[PDB]
Amino acid sequence: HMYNPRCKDLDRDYFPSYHTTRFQDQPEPNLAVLEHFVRVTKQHGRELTEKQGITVDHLRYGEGRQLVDVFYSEKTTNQAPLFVFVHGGYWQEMDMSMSCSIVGPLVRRGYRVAVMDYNLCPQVTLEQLMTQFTHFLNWIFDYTEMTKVSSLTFAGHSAGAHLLAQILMRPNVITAQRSKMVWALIFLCGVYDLRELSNLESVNPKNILGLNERNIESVSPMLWEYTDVTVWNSTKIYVVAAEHDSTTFIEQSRHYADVLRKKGYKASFTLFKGYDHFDIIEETAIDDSDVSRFLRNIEI
């Protein structure tokens, strides 16, 4: 138990749902929280286009679930900045319909918002999902370039934070110019070192992540040898943990922030009071929420 010197149970430290303070009168609060998350995020999604006057374009960067929905207000110019959101779900669950809580307040602040979906393990190995995600980063920059827009922010949650980390190490796709377009990278409650969970059946049953010893460094942002850091020093990096996450998740974020800082990235660690791993996303649908205020404050 790296990341939790005082851990008793390594598995439960890898399921953030056991770590909330919500639904503590529920016999299984971990299932309550998941149920609630599914429900409210689907509701946020419908409210975006049925109530909030927001428009969506349904696009694709690949076959099947490799989709990108772009949300915008027609009352706003087409040359607005683009905010990109990458959803979580341990590379094996979640979809677009539960991923759009973040959209509404951003559109009201004058962003266009791209919410993407991806193929899940074991339809791909994690390595292959990562190659596909590289196709997505190429797509999003081609899309922004075509639109002749040259300001972006990316944010990923959980597994999505893990995925987003490769943006720092794909220079055959991410040119110096592409890098210079990025205002900020936001890593919400991600995981960055997969050596412990790779060996657990509860997280990686029957090895559906398709992991092993040759590729464990490559799927672990924590362990990479970062190079050409200088092209990112126009980009602010925010590594964020929720206070009510597992100590393992919290420390994974703290340590990843340390790794980046030590490499010379403009990175910071934030422990966000009052949130667990889930409501930190749920509350992004509320303009006045603490998390919303945080995202807004990044702009300054």
Ligand code: NA
């Ligand atoms: Na711009």
